[PDB]
Design a protein around this ligand. Structure first.
Ligand code: HEM
Ligand code: HEM
Ligand code: HEM
Ligand code: HEM
Lengths: 141, 146, 141, 146
């Protein structure tokens, strides 16, 4: 459950990210592929080589989505309904993987935003990705 | 613990730059703030009501140091994490009762924290190495549970 | 999302359960302590011995909580609310443990209801369980 | 692997009683029914729309056998799982891209199925060593993903 306070910090953090979103997404993505090799199984039609167009393109799709979630926080499930049907019913990615992408996002975020990433920001951010993750795996069944 | 020398080395060179008092308090502290249920375990630590409180609590900064302290013994004997953390294991399982799932949390927060500290110097590849280490550690901590 | 048919099956299978419920619950708890020692850190105060009597009664309490949960199929989140605080808030039980316990309730019932546990019912029980698990775990942050 | 003689003994023991041919179908089958997302790995299997379509599918029954076949061959090799499953790991990762979390799923579905054939005899301590073995088999199939 997103608290008024969480929302606020999420808006702030994410706005500080600003036009780095994508860049942050790709870095995050890449950090995921090296750290948890098993997530690569869901991307076999991808060049997953260091700094590479697919990933640097996909990172953009991933952080733009997040962005839509920040803006659409008080209402995350309708905002994200599509993303839900592709990840749960079509792509069918296992919830574990989401915990991993989150962690990596946090590392990435945590490493470019040294002063905004306080222990309350860190916290909120974790509730936020968790929530996005739920809405995203929710329609498994 | 498939640790490749370029990683044993990656992990190693960085640790040498860690300010133990700071990263130790900070991890332990981010652990209580981000995952408040861990708060229960150090009820006896005193005030853990608010962020600033937890980050500011001397029992928390100190324990913090003792925890990072022990991560160190682990980087010094990576080929024997089990033997190393054997005692700590049962302590955590026999006297303390911490569900070994919390170890991952700790290791991850912590990986969270080194990155907050070293910024761009905590490149992806390096993160993969600590991920392996922090995982070896949780495991070793969990080993002697019965 | 629990379905009409899913529902129809939880009920019929929970009914053959009958008065073996408690007993089944204890067997389940026992199966869990024995296969996933970590889970016992939540029970440092219990006599956890084979055949224990603190156990039986707890199992007893767990199966009833599940019966009630069935009885209020359509409003689980309320029906089970007071058990939710109990586990999210005071006990503070990390989710995986919910999975291990469901796994055992499945195993246990599998061994007692040869002919009730057909695929489609198995599919509904893991779901129902998942559901009772999602409710008891949701106030975790 | 933490397999005491007792456990091994009990594992190996119960296994000789198992109808390899029919048990494997039961399993891959229930996997396909209970955790539907797996189905996306066997389009080539034809119809999977209802439970009867799955449980009864001959192509499912056959595959199931192969799987249980390899499992068997792994219980004849408990002290060397990783090797025994080395080649099957690569394939499972490089050629078919199966998220390893799914092994844990077959494996537990597997424990459920044995539970169903033997009733009371699938006693707790027995289940215990089965989980230790299905856990093993899952780490050893996961062991070469890269
Ligand atoms: C915060 C969590 C995540 C968000 C917000 C997210 C968002 C997205 C978005 C926006 C797309 C683009 C689809 C389109 O163009 O309409 C996508 C595709 C995809 N995602 Fe995610 N995703 C998340 C987590 C994951 C994770 C955990 C996985 C698996 C590890 C994953 C795997 C995929 C795959 C395989 C695609 C399709 C890419 C392609 O086929 O080109 N996503 N995701
Ligand atoms: C692998 C990660 C961890 C390591 C390396 C570690 C290390 C330690 C160490 C060194 C002690 C020293 C006390 C002594 O020597 O007498 C300790 C005690 C303790 N550990 Fe852990 N720990 C970890 C994770 C956790 C977590 C996840 C919890 C639960 C939140 C926890 C709860 C405790 C508590 C409550 C104490 C004793 C506090 C006191 O009364 O002094 N630890 N731990
Ligand atoms: C479907 C899953 C579960 C159900 C339905 C359930 C049900 C219950 C109920 C009804 C109570 C006590 C009600 C009363 O005050 O009389 C309880 C307490 C408790 N449960 Fe759960 N439980 C479940 C899973 C678990 C999990 C997974 C664990 C941790 C592994 C757990 C640990 C506990 C503990 C420690 C207590 C308190 C017992 C005591 O100290 O007396 N339960 N549970
Ligand atoms: C105990 C765990 C498992 C074992 C021992 C096992 C074993 C096998 C074996 C022996 C094969 C055939 C080898 C070959 O075809 O050359 C196989 C093939 C295959 N496996 Fe697994 N498997 C396991 C779990 C899984 C699961 C969970 C999946 C996906 C959910 C999977 C997906 C596949 C696929 C797609 C094939 C090829 C299908 C075909 O030839 O039509 N395996 N597995």
């Amino acid at each position: 459950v997103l608290s008024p306070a969480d929302k606020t910090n999420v808006k702030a953090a994410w706005g500080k990210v600003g036009a780095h979103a994508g860049e942050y997404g790709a870095e995050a993505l890449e950090r995921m592929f090296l750290s948890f090799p098993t997530t690569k199984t869901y991307f076999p039609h991808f060049d997953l080589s260091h700094g590479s167009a697919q990933v640097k393109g996909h990172g953009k799709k991933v952080a733009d989505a997040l962005t839509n979630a920040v803006a659409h926080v008080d209402d995350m499930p309708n905002a994200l309904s599509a993303l839900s049907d592709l990840h749960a019913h079509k792509l069918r990615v296992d919830p574990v993987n989401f915990k991993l992408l989150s962690h990596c996002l946090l590392v990435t975020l945590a490493a470019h935003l040294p002063a905004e990433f306080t222990p309350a920001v860190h916290a909120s951010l974790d509730k936020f990705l968790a929530s996005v993750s739920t809405v995203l795996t929710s329609k498994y069944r | 613990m498939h640790l490749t020398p370029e990683e044993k080395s990656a992990v190693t060179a960085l640790w040498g730059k860690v300010n133990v008092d700071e990263v130790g308090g900070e991890a332990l502290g981010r652990l209580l703030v981000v995952y408040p249920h861990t708060q229960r375990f150090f009820e006896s630590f005193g005030d853990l009501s608010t962020p600033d409180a937890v980050m500011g609590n001397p029992k928390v900064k100190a324990h913090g140091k003792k925890v990072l302290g022990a991560f160190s013994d682990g980087l010094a004997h990576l080929d024997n994490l089990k033997g190393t953390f054997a005692t700590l294991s049962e302590l955590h399982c026999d006297k303390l009762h911490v569900d070994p799932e919390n170890f991952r949390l700790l290791g991850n927060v912590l990986v969270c924290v080194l990155a907050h500290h070293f910024g761009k110097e905590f490149t992806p590849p390096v993160q993969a190495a600590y991920q392996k280490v922090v995982a070896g550690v949780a495991n070793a901590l969990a080993h002697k549970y019965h």
